[PDB]
Amino acid sequence: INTQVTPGEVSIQLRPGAEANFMLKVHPLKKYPVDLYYLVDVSASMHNNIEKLNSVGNDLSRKMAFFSRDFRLGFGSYVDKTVSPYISIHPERIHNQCSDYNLDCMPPHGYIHVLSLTENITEFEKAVHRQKISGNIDTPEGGFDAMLQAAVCESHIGWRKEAKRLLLVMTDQTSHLALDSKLAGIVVPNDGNCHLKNNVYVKSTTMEHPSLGQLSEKLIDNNINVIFAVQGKQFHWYKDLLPLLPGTIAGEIESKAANLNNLVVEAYQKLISEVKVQVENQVQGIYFNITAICPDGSRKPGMEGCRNVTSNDEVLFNVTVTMKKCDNYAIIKPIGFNETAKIHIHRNC
Amino acid sequence: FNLDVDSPAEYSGPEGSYFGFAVDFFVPSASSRMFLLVGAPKANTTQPGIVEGGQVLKCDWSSTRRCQPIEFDATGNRDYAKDDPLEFKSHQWFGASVRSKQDKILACAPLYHWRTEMKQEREPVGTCFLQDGTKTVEYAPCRSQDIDADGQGFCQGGFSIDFTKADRVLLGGPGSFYWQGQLISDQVAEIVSKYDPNVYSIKYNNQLATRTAQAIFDDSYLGYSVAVGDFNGDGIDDFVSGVPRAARTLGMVYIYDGKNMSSLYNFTGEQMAAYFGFSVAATDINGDDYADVFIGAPLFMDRGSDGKLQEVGQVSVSLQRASGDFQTTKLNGFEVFARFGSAIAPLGDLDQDGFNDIAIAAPYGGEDKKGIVYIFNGRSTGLNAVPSQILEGQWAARSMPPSFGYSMKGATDIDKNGYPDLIVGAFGVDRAILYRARPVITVNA
Amino acid sequence: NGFTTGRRGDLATIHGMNRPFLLLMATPLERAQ
Ligand SMILES: *[C@@H]1O[C@H](CO)[C@@H](O[C@@H]2O[C@H](CO)[C@@H](O[C@@H]3O[C@H](CO[C@H]4O[C@H](CO)[C@@H](O)[C@H](O)[C@@H]4O)[C@@H](O)[C@H](O[C@H]4O[C@H](CO)[C@@H](O)[C@H](O)[C@@H]4O[C@H]4O[C@H](CO)[C@@H](O)[C@H](O)[C@@H]4O)[C@@H]3O)[C@H](O)[C@H]2NC(C)=O)[C@H](O)[C@H]1NC(C)=O
Ligand SMILES: *[C@@H]1O[C@H](CO)[C@@H](O[C@@H]2O[C@H](CO)[C@@H](O)[C@H](O)[C@H]2NC(C)=O)[C@H](O)[C@H]1NC(C)=O
Ligand SMILES: *[C@@H]1O[C@H](CO)[C@@H](O[C@@H]2O[C@H](CO)[C@@H](O)[C@H](O)[C@H]2NC(C)=O)[C@H](O)[C@H]1NC(C)=O
Ligand SMILES: *[C@@H]1O[C@H](CO)[C@@H](O[C@@H]2O[C@H](CO)[C@@H](O)[C@H](O)[C@H]2NC(C)=O)[C@H](O)[C@H]1NC(C)=O
Ligand SMILES: *[C@@H]1O[C@H](CO)[C@@H](O[C@@H]2O[C@H](CO)[C@@H](O)[C@H](O)[C@H]2NC(C)=O)[C@H](O)[C@H]1NC(C)=O
Ligand SMILES: *[C@@H]1O[C@H](CO)[C@@H](O)[C@H](O)[C@H]1NC(C)=O
Ligand SMILES: *[C@@H]1O[C@H](CO)[C@@H](O)[C@H](O)[C@H]1NC(C)=O
Ligand SMILES: *[C@@H]1O[C@H](CO)[C@@H](O)[C@H](O)[C@H]1NC(C)=O
Ligand SMILES: [Ca+2]
Ligand SMILES: [Ca+2]
Ligand SMILES: [Ca+2]
Ligand SMILES: [Ca+2]
Ligand SMILES: [Ca+2]
Ligand SMILES: [Mg+2]
């Protein structure tokens, strides 16, 4: 049944003090239907860059006509949590933080979903063209909470299981962390469900941000391939976090922002030219050992896997299951891929 | 290992009032009786026109658990002019930080917005009420003549507080100077004697504070948590504060000289976005008469065996030496997502051996994420890195997680059995719990 | 506008617009005579 990750299932029996093995082969496919989502920061700092979203409609779809069977796009915006001291609570400023500068800024909002994924590029251009900016006070902005909400809500955004889910997060500044909410009286940890009721993030103001570990777990669970597109010096901040966030890419947007379509397409090519795996083991005493066999023969430890992969090129993962102590299964999946291998490990004591 | 979990003394506040957010002991030696002190930052009050002010309920231990709120303040919002309120006490989170010397109580409100004098605004400067026996005072050094987001307008003064052993109050405002942070030290012998109930910006003669820095230090959050202890041999306690977003969210911890607020030593985290400096507690854990630093990083992500990362938390132990050096050791948590290292509190000498002890909490750990507290014992070398006792919360989550272990206190014997005790606050179910340390006998077979 | 206290944080960019400016009306170089 599985086409890209073979074998898709393995039944093995082990006895304590013994070790088994098999071969797991991952063969990337030629072309991928791509679903891209623009989780765009629309804070006051990002005002000069929203207008540069009118070019990405047709140009990118032309650039990505050979790398993908079909194409989809979507939109969505975030600024921050709408409580003090992140926003002003003055009755004049609470609904337009820019009013002291005579601007038509939109009311701040934790996260609003705008356009579900559609193959109509004219719809994407129309949705982007009518979009305004908002404002707040703090230097960082609440991007990670919006990222989690966009990753988890599936039928609202409109992700495809048959696609290559990508998520572009366009910003220019560092994001808020988990425990930064304690200044605002939010001491309730994030639960990891998603709470879009009318395409507005209702619970942005009652539970705090997600941490890096929770965000990463939710991203990899839903097969989301994140592509940060940061602009200022904070590209480096978003880059040094890549080790802590598997399967994420960071590109730099120059001042002219003419390098946006290229950023997306080169990031997609680098994304498609890599394979790596992890294991979600919840069994007691069983330790997994995986060494990757690159087409150049390298004996990489597998956790970062083999890079520079293309099609016409099959990558093989050497596994070694141990049985150390007695008292389920483990699923080993290539991060970013849509298929997983279910190692239905039997254990007998 | 001697704390008694068979007979914990229970306490309870109003539902949904965050009872137990901050805990402490009250021991007025003049009255020779022992009282708890619990904050309820979401409690309703008697104040007119104020909803959800905050209460500091003084609870008794001697067989009567009656919690009588301390009347730190009874009035509503003072006014600037007709229908021009000067301050906004609603939802002020009063009592989120309770500290008690032998005969003083200092409870602070960090979310106290007010209408600045120059223009109609809402600036969360924060305020504190210092009750000294009979006299009650108000302490609010972050509402001043020069305030805005630029200045200390968003100071949130009173997010963290502590008492120096020399009658000073160390106050930490995380949000001043565009969230760079600030520490302020001032003596009680002047807080009381300088309080005009009709003056807002009061100038204190002998106050020590930290000033503005370069714009690259924004969102550092200095003063997110404070502690005291002698660290350069002068004898006067020195101000230790945690700045958990410095150096590109690595986290740092500063130590300032307690005589003139001059920087002495710095620490630095090793992982980005780990919250180094979230909790700071300076005790003497190896018994060598030199105070030792403890630092919490609840969100540290630690490599697993296979290479997968786990967010388990980490506590850094740093033993002060006689030459100005620090011998540092790490200490990792036990359950993923448990936020080990959230709260650290010295216990005194929990078993009377000669080396003070310490306890570290993992509020979201344990079975069904009720909460767990770990008990550590000192040695001649330093801390003993395996916990002797595991304290677990007994309360299920009603709406939000019980958060058993968010705040805790020790080092005072309430039974007067000779050994220090411990109170813990599981504010997610509006409870506090007291634990008693049993006497220890050495059998020599 | 543009002269209130130095705004840092998220408002720093926005502070600069509506700044006092000049409005120049001159003939084009290509249509002199
Ligand atoms: C523990 O860790 C903390 C934090 O990392 C650290 O505190 C930091 O200390 C440094 C040094 O004291 C602070 O940086 C600056 O230090 C200079 C000292 O001046 C002399 O040294 C510099 C070094 O190159 C020389 O260039 C200079 O000419 C002198 O010889 C201060 O002068 C700085 O003050 C500036 O800010 C003031 C307020 O804005 C201004 O009024 C003042 O004029 C200075 O302005 C300068 O910079 C401006 C930048 O825009 C510029 O516009 C001005 O024209 C001028 O050039 C400043 O103090 C740093 O701020 C501290 N950070 C924090 C958070 O406190 C501790 O030292 C460290 N301790 C230990 C023991 O490790
Ligand atoms: C793709 O979306 C565009 C709008 O973004 C659609 O064009 C609209 O078509 C309706 C008729 O159904 C007209 O009344 C509108 O004036 C059109 N808008 C624009 C901007 O031209 C287009 O029909 C959509 N594609 C398909 C196949 O339906
Ligand atoms: C993973 O992706 C592949 C291709 O992107 C999916 O394979 C397609 O499956 C649909 C039905 O599910 C078929 O109609 C197509 O013909 C298949 N295409 C190819 C190229 O094989 C596969 O189903 C996806 N797996 C999951 C679990 O969503
Ligand atoms: C894949 O891994 C297995 C181990 O699980 C390798 O099998 C070992 O091969 C070496 C080479 O001769 C033998 O000395 C060992 O006795 C074999 N078994 C074990 C348990 O080590 C196998 O060679 C690997 N294949 C590749 C292509 O790397
Ligand atoms: C303190 O009392 C006030 C009322 O005086 C309570 O306010 C309630 O707030 C909820 C949601 O904000 C409303 O649905 C209720 O209608 C309010 N009550 C009334 C009587 O109007 C507040 O919940 C109380 N605080 C606590 C901690 O119990
Ligand atoms: C995994 O295999 C490597 C060599 O293939 C070996 O050095 C290592 O000890 C093994 N680890 C486990 C847990 O089996
Ligand atoms: C990646 O693959 C291409 C094509 O096989 C090859 O030319 C290139 O040298 C490879 N990169 C590295 C670093 O070996
Ligand atoms: C602060 O006091 C200590 C005590 O000796 C001294 O070493 C230091 O130089 C003083 N700092 C300032 C700025 O006066
Ligand atoms: Ca923000
Ligand atoms: Ca000192
Ligand atoms: Ca010591
Ligand atoms: Ca001891
Ligand atoms: Ca006792
Ligand atoms: Mg911004």
PDB file of N, CA, C and O and ligand atoms in Angstrom, chain B residues 180 210-217 220 222 243 246-247 252-256 262-268, ligand 1:
ATOM      1  N   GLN B 180      13.354  46.022  29.884  1.00  0.00           N
ATOM      2  CA  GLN B 180      14.706  45.661  30.290  1.00  0.00           C
ATOM      3  C   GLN B 180      14.733  45.120  31.710  1.00  0.00           C
ATOM      4  O   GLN B 180      15.539  44.235  32.019  1.00  0.00           O
ATOM      5  N   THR B 210      18.667  50.258  39.934  1.00  0.00           N
ATOM      6  CA  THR B 210      19.440  50.058  38.717  1.00  0.00           C
ATOM      7  C   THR B 210      18.815  50.861  37.583  1.00  0.00           C
ATOM      8  O   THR B 210      17.590  50.978  37.489  1.00  0.00           O
ATOM      9  N   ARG B 211      19.664  51.445  36.744  1.00  0.00           N
ATOM     10  CA  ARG B 211      19.251  52.461  35.791  1.00  0.00           C
ATOM     11  C   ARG B 211      19.131  51.888  34.380  1.00  0.00           C
ATOM     12  O   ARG B 211      19.212  50.677  34.161  1.00  0.00           O
ATOM     13  N   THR B 212      18.933  52.777  33.408  1.00  0.00           N
ATOM     14  CA  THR B 212      18.610  52.400  32.041  1.00  0.00           C
ATOM     15  C   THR B 212      19.861  51.988  31.272  1.00  0.00           C
ATOM     16  O   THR B 212      20.947  52.538  31.469  1.00  0.00           O
ATOM     17  N   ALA B 213      19.691  51.016  30.376  1.00  0.00           N
ATOM     18  CA  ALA B 213      20.787  50.510  29.559  1.00  0.00           C
ATOM     19  C   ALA B 213      20.487  50.683  28.077  1.00  0.00           C
ATOM     20  O   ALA B 213      19.509  51.338  27.707  1.00  0.00           O
ATOM     21  N   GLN B 214      21.325  50.103  27.221  1.00  0.00           N
ATOM     22  CA  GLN B 214      21.179  50.275  25.785  1.00  0.00           C
ATOM     23  C   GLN B 214      19.964  49.509  25.272  1.00  0.00           C
ATOM     24  O   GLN B 214      19.468  48.576  25.904  1.00  0.00           O
ATOM     25  N   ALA B 215      19.495  49.911  24.090  1.00  0.00           N
ATOM     26  CA  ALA B 215      18.259  49.372  23.539  1.00  0.00           C
ATOM     27  C   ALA B 215      18.376  47.921  23.101  1.00  0.00           C
ATOM     28  O   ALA B 215      17.354  47.310  22.781  1.00  0.00           O
ATOM     29  N   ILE B 216      19.586  47.357  23.062  1.00  0.00           N
ATOM     30  CA  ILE B 216      19.730  45.938  22.740  1.00  0.00           C
ATOM     31  C   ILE B 216      19.326  45.037  23.890  1.00  0.00           C
ATOM     32  O   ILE B 216      19.288  43.813  23.720  1.00  0.00           O
ATOM     33  N   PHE B 217      19.021  45.607  25.053  1.00  0.00           N
ATOM     34  CA  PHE B 217      18.678  44.842  26.240  1.00  0.00           C
ATOM     35  C   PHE B 217      17.179  44.746  26.468  1.00  0.00           C
ATOM     36  O   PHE B 217      16.757  44.272  27.525  1.00  0.00           O
ATOM     37  N   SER B 220      14.600  41.859  28.368  1.00  0.00           N
ATOM     38  CA  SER B 220      15.457  41.024  29.198  1.00  0.00           C
ATOM     39  C   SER B 220      14.695  40.467  30.392  1.00  0.00           C
ATOM     40  O   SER B 220      14.878  39.303  30.759  1.00  0.00           O
ATOM     41  N   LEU B 222      14.752  41.710  33.647  1.00  0.00           N
ATOM     42  CA  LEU B 222      15.465  41.743  34.915  1.00  0.00           C
ATOM     43  C   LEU B 222      14.479  41.961  36.053  1.00  0.00           C
ATOM     44  O   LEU B 222      13.533  42.739  35.931  1.00  0.00           O
ATOM     45  N   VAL B 243      17.224  37.135  35.149  1.00  0.00           N
ATOM     46  CA  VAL B 243      16.847  37.823  33.920  1.00  0.00           C
ATOM     47  C   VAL B 243      16.732  36.796  32.796  1.00  0.00           C
ATOM     48  O   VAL B 243      17.699  36.540  32.068  1.00  0.00           O
ATOM     49  N   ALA B 246      17.850  37.306  28.630  1.00  0.00           N
ATOM     50  CA  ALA B 246      19.032  38.004  28.164  1.00  0.00           C
ATOM     51  C   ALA B 246      19.814  37.130  27.192  1.00  0.00           C
ATOM     52  O   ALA B 246      19.644  35.912  27.136  1.00  0.00           O
ATOM     53  N   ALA B 247      20.671  37.782  26.406  1.00  0.00           N
ATOM     54  CA  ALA B 247      21.591  37.101  25.497  1.00  0.00           C
ATOM     55  C   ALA B 247      20.844  36.180  24.532  1.00  0.00           C
ATOM     56  O   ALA B 247      21.082  34.974  24.475  1.00  0.00           O
ATOM     57  N   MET B 252      20.142  34.839  31.762  1.00  0.00           N
ATOM     58  CA  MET B 252      21.278  35.195  32.594  1.00  0.00           C
ATOM     59  C   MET B 252      20.788  35.407  34.016  1.00  0.00           C
ATOM     60  O   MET B 252      19.586  35.434  34.283  1.00  0.00           O
ATOM     61  N   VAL B 253      21.735  35.533  34.935  1.00  0.00           N
ATOM     62  CA  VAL B 253      21.444  35.879  36.318  1.00  0.00           C
ATOM     63  C   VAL B 253      22.491  36.880  36.772  1.00  0.00           C
ATOM     64  O   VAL B 253      23.692  36.660  36.586  1.00  0.00           O
ATOM     65  N   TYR B 254      22.040  37.985  37.355  1.00  0.00           N
ATOM     66  CA  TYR B 254      22.926  39.029  37.839  1.00  0.00           C
ATOM     67  C   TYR B 254      23.001  38.984  39.356  1.00  0.00           C
ATOM     68  O   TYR B 254      22.053  38.578  40.030  1.00  0.00           O
ATOM     69  N   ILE B 255      24.143  39.406  39.884  1.00  0.00           N
ATOM     70  CA  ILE B 255      24.343  39.584  41.315  1.00  0.00           C
ATOM     71  C   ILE B 255      24.897  40.981  41.535  1.00  0.00           C
ATOM     72  O   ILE B 255      25.933  41.338  40.964  1.00  0.00           O
ATOM     73  N   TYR B 256      24.215  41.762  42.363  1.00  0.00           N
ATOM     74  CA  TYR B 256      24.569  43.148  42.620  1.00  0.00           C
ATOM     75  C   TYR B 256      25.030  43.312  44.060  1.00  0.00           C
ATOM     76  O   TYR B 256      24.515  42.650  44.964  1.00  0.00           O
ATOM     77  N   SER B 262      26.230  47.725  42.810  1.00  0.00           N
ATOM     78  CA  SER B 262      27.270  47.632  41.796  1.00  0.00           C
ATOM     79  C   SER B 262      27.445  46.173  41.411  1.00  0.00           C
ATOM     80  O   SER B 262      27.552  45.309  42.285  1.00  0.00           O
ATOM     81  N   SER B 263      27.470  45.904  40.109  1.00  0.00           N
ATOM     82  CA  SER B 263      27.501  44.528  39.628  1.00  0.00           C
ATOM     83  C   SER B 263      28.752  43.807  40.114  1.00  0.00           C
ATOM     84  O   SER B 263      29.854  44.360  40.089  1.00  0.00           O
ATOM     85  N   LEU B 264      28.574  42.564  40.554  1.00  0.00           N
ATOM     86  CA  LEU B 264      29.667  41.745  41.059  1.00  0.00           C
ATOM     87  C   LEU B 264      29.925  40.518  40.205  1.00  0.00           C
ATOM     88  O   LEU B 264      31.058  40.304  39.761  1.00  0.00           O
ATOM     89  N   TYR B 265      28.905  39.698  39.963  1.00  0.00           N
ATOM     90  CA  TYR B 265      29.078  38.457  39.228  1.00  0.00           C
ATOM     91  C   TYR B 265      27.901  38.248  38.293  1.00  0.00           C
ATOM     92  O   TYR B 265      26.808  38.774  38.505  1.00  0.00           O
ATOM     93  N   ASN B 266      28.148  37.467  37.246  1.00  0.00           N
ATOM     94  CA  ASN B 266      27.155  37.143  36.238  1.00  0.00           C
ATOM     95  C   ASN B 266      27.143  35.643  36.007  1.00  0.00           C
ATOM     96  O   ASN B 266      28.165  34.970  36.147  1.00  0.00           O
ATOM     97  N   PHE B 267      25.975  35.124  35.650  1.00  0.00           N
ATOM     98  CA  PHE B 267      25.846  33.764  35.159  1.00  0.00           C
ATOM     99  C   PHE B 267      25.241  33.835  33.769  1.00  0.00           C
ATOM    100  O   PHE B 267      24.807  34.897  33.317  1.00  0.00           O
ATOM    101  N   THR B 268      25.217  32.704  33.072  1.00  0.00           N
ATOM    102  CA  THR B 268      24.682  32.681  31.718  1.00  0.00           C
ATOM    103  C   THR B 268      24.178  31.285  31.405  1.00  0.00           C
ATOM    104  O   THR B 268      24.791  30.295  31.805  1.00  0.00           O
TER     105      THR B 268
HETATM  106  C1  LIG D   1      27.123  41.448  33.878  1.00  0.00           C
HETATM  107  O1  LIG D   1      26.362  41.572  32.687  1.00  0.00           O
HETATM  108  C2  LIG D   1      25.778  42.867  32.503  1.00  0.00           C
HETATM  109  C3  LIG D   1      24.946  42.788  31.246  1.00  0.00           C
HETATM  110  O2  LIG D   1      25.635  42.087  30.221  1.00  0.00           O
HETATM  111  C4  LIG D   1      26.868  43.933  32.430  1.00  0.00           C
HETATM  112  O3  LIG D   1      26.242  45.211  32.400  1.00  0.00           O
HETATM  113  C5  LIG D   1      26.614  45.938  31.211  1.00  0.00           C
HETATM  114  O4  LIG D   1      27.799  46.673  31.433  1.00  0.00           O
HETATM  115  C6  LIG D   1      28.256  47.394  30.279  1.00  0.00           C
HETATM  116  C7  LIG D   1      29.566  48.028  30.676  1.00  0.00           C
HETATM  117  O5  LIG D   1      29.446  48.726  31.907  1.00  0.00           O
HETATM  118  C8  LIG D   1      27.200  48.406  29.827  1.00  0.00           C
HETATM  119  O6  LIG D   1      27.596  48.969  28.580  1.00  0.00           O
HETATM  120  C9  LIG D   1      27.973  50.387  28.515  1.00  0.00           C
HETATM  121  O7  LIG D   1      29.178  50.659  29.253  1.00  0.00           O
HETATM  122  C10 LIG D   1      29.711  51.965  28.976  1.00  0.00           C
HETATM  123  C11 LIG D   1      31.050  52.104  29.670  1.00  0.00           C
HETATM  124  O8  LIG D   1      31.741  53.154  29.015  1.00  0.00           O
HETATM  125  C12 LIG D   1      33.141  52.832  28.858  1.00  0.00           C
HETATM  126  O9  LIG D   1      33.339  51.563  28.223  1.00  0.00           O
HETATM  127  C13 LIG D   1      32.958  51.446  26.821  1.00  0.00           C
HETATM  128  C14 LIG D   1      33.352  50.055  26.364  1.00  0.00           C
HETATM  129  O10 LIG D   1      33.609  50.104  24.966  1.00  0.00           O
HETATM  130  C15 LIG D   1      33.626  52.550  26.004  1.00  0.00           C
HETATM  131  O11 LIG D   1      33.164  52.478  24.667  1.00  0.00           O
HETATM  132  C16 LIG D   1      33.267  53.906  26.604  1.00  0.00           C
HETATM  133  O12 LIG D   1      33.791  54.957  25.803  1.00  0.00           O
HETATM  134  C17 LIG D   1      33.762  53.985  28.037  1.00  0.00           C
HETATM  135  O13 LIG D   1      35.182  53.857  27.959  1.00  0.00           O
HETATM  136  C18 LIG D   1      28.692  53.032  29.425  1.00  0.00           C
HETATM  137  O14 LIG D   1      29.178  54.315  29.091  1.00  0.00           O
HETATM  138  C19 LIG D   1      27.343  52.781  28.733  1.00  0.00           C
HETATM  139  O15 LIG D   1      26.394  53.802  29.069  1.00  0.00           O
HETATM  140  C20 LIG D   1      25.710  54.173  27.845  1.00  0.00           C
HETATM  141  O16 LIG D   1      24.298  54.307  28.072  1.00  0.00           O
HETATM  142  C21 LIG D   1      23.872  55.445  28.842  1.00  0.00           C
HETATM  143  C22 LIG D   1      22.367  55.381  28.929  1.00  0.00           C
HETATM  144  O17 LIG D   1      21.863  55.170  27.613  1.00  0.00           O
HETATM  145  C23 LIG D   1      24.360  56.713  28.156  1.00  0.00           C
HETATM  146  O18 LIG D   1      23.919  57.844  28.885  1.00  0.00           O
HETATM  147  C24 LIG D   1      25.879  56.684  28.104  1.00  0.00           C
HETATM  148  O19 LIG D   1      26.376  57.911  27.581  1.00  0.00           O
HETATM  149  C25 LIG D   1      26.334  55.493  27.284  1.00  0.00           C
HETATM  150  O20 LIG D   1      25.846  55.756  25.969  1.00  0.00           O
HETATM  151  C26 LIG D   1      26.754  55.209  24.992  1.00  0.00           C
HETATM  152  O21 LIG D   1      26.090  54.270  24.174  1.00  0.00           O
HETATM  153  C27 LIG D   1      24.969  54.785  23.422  1.00  0.00           C
HETATM  154  C28 LIG D   1      24.388  53.626  22.629  1.00  0.00           C
HETATM  155  O22 LIG D   1      23.397  54.140  21.752  1.00  0.00           O
HETATM  156  C29 LIG D   1      25.445  55.937  22.527  1.00  0.00           C
HETATM  157  O23 LIG D   1      24.329  56.507  21.867  1.00  0.00           O
HETATM  158  C30 LIG D   1      26.143  57.001  23.380  1.00  0.00           C
HETATM  159  O24 LIG D   1      26.588  58.073  22.561  1.00  0.00           O
HETATM  160  C31 LIG D   1      27.288  56.387  24.163  1.00  0.00           C
HETATM  161  O25 LIG D   1      28.219  55.942  23.178  1.00  0.00           O
HETATM  162  C32 LIG D   1      26.853  51.369  29.043  1.00  0.00           C
HETATM  163  O26 LIG D   1      26.723  51.324  30.447  1.00  0.00           O
HETATM  164  C33 LIG D   1      25.852  47.720  29.635  1.00  0.00           C
HETATM  165  O27 LIG D   1      24.838  48.689  29.395  1.00  0.00           O
HETATM  166  C34 LIG D   1      25.481  46.896  30.863  1.00  0.00           C
HETATM  167  N1  LIG D   1      24.240  46.172  30.639  1.00  0.00           N
HETATM  168  C35 LIG D   1      23.286  46.067  31.569  1.00  0.00           C
HETATM  169  C36 LIG D   1      22.071  45.283  31.178  1.00  0.00           C
HETATM  170  O28 LIG D   1      23.396  46.583  32.673  1.00  0.00           O
HETATM  171  C37 LIG D   1      27.785  43.846  33.643  1.00  0.00           C
HETATM  172  O29 LIG D   1      28.895  44.720  33.479  1.00  0.00           O
HETATM  173  C38 LIG D   1      28.293  42.422  33.842  1.00  0.00           C
HETATM  174  N2  LIG D   1      29.089  42.332  35.054  1.00  0.00           N
HETATM  175  C39 LIG D   1      30.017  41.393  35.255  1.00  0.00           C
HETATM  176  C40 LIG D   1      30.744  41.456  36.562  1.00  0.00           C
HETATM  177  O30 LIG D   1      30.254  40.526  34.421  1.00  0.00           O
END
